Amino acid sequence: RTADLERARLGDDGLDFQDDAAQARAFAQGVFLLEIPEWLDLSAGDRFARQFFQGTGVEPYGKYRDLSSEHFGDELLGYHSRVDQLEQFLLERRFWGEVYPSEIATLGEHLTLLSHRVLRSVLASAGIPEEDWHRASGGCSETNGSYHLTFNHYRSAHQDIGLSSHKDDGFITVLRTTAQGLEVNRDDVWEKVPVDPACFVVNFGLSMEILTSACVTPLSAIMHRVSHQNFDRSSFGHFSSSRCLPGADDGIYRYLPSAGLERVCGSRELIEENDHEIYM
Ligand SMILES: C[C@H]1CCO[C@]2([C@@H](O)[C@@](C)(O)CO)NC(=O)[C@H]1NC2=O
Ligand SMILES: O=C(O)CCC(=O)C(=O)O
Numbered sequence: 001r002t003a004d005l006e007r008a009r010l011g012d013d014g015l016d017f018q019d020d021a022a023q024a025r026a027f028a029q030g031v032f033l034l035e036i037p038e039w040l041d042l043s044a045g046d047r048f049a050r051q052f053f054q055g056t057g058v059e060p061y062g063k064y065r066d067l068s069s070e071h072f073g074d075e076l077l078g079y080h081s082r083v084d085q086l087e088q089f090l091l092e093r094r095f096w097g098e099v100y101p102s103e104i105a106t107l108g109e110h111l112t113l114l115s116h117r118v119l120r121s122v123l124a125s126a127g128i129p130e131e132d133w134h135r136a137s138g139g140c141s142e143t144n145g146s147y148h149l150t151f152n153h154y155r156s157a158h159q160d161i162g163l164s165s166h167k168d169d170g171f172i173t174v175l176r177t178t179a180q181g182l183e184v185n186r187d188d189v190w191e192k193v194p195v196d197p198a199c200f201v202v203n204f205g206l207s208m209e210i211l212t213s214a215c216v217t218p219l220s221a222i223m224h225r226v227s228h229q230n231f232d233r234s235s236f237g238h239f240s241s242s243r244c245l246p247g248a249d250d251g252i253y254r255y256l257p258s259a260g261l262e263r264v265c266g267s268r269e270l271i272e273e274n275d276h277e278i279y280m
């Protein structure tokens, strides 16, 4: 029914779970709760998620409904109506300063540095050598990855599932949710993720699963979905991927213990393949 997730916070040494066993469960499941720093203001992001889809009559964020992928030269970006209840606004970090409201780009930057700290804690626990982190993470072990700040709205009038079962593409997703609907399939049973507006939900994407698939303790990309919503719902997430610019793709790698990194596919290629199976 309801998943019982481990809870972590970022501290002086990195990710702090209650004990080492709890960290191992969290990383093995591929999903856990992360305490939101008390200084971090999420209210503008919350408002953007409630407004982005409403058009230019609605201030200050409704106008982002009018920015489609054409305006960015990148089919992933801008406003997208999906086949499920979900509609989205997606923007990669290279456009945040120019295109997002200033306070929304600020939020994106805070989340990038928090996620960077989360990812480095995970890479260390996997025993991957530090000098391989940059290439293994497509730049996300520093701040050279591809980062999408993505706003979600579930149109409860559409007779669809909220968002189909899927795995995220990348290494780390930091998910901000304040209402029921998110479900996870940790072990062949769907379970509700408990709502705690004081925590983010963190999960691993396909790139984390590929990277660690040959390690002693492989880490999984959690299968998750959003159930059919009878009232409206919104949320947003920060997604870290191997640099996947249209002209500069850092590739997707698997770590072979005692050997090094082996290339599996392209970063954008993984995203296109994954977006395909999610929706059709
Ligand atoms: C890379 C980018 C686009 C790909 O789509 C995802 C995907 O999780 C989803 C469900 O939001 C697309 O609808 N969203 C992102 O922001 C990012 N990662 C995803 O997996
Ligand atoms: O809205 C949610 O809670 C989840 C959204 C999600 O999983 C995604 O956008 O990839």
Ligand SMILES: [Cl-]
Pocket (backbone or CB within 6 Å): 081, 087, 155
């Ligand atoms: Cl609509």
Ligand SMILES: [Fe+2]
Pocket (backbone or CB within 6 Å): 166, 167, 168, 224
């Ligand atoms: Fe997701």
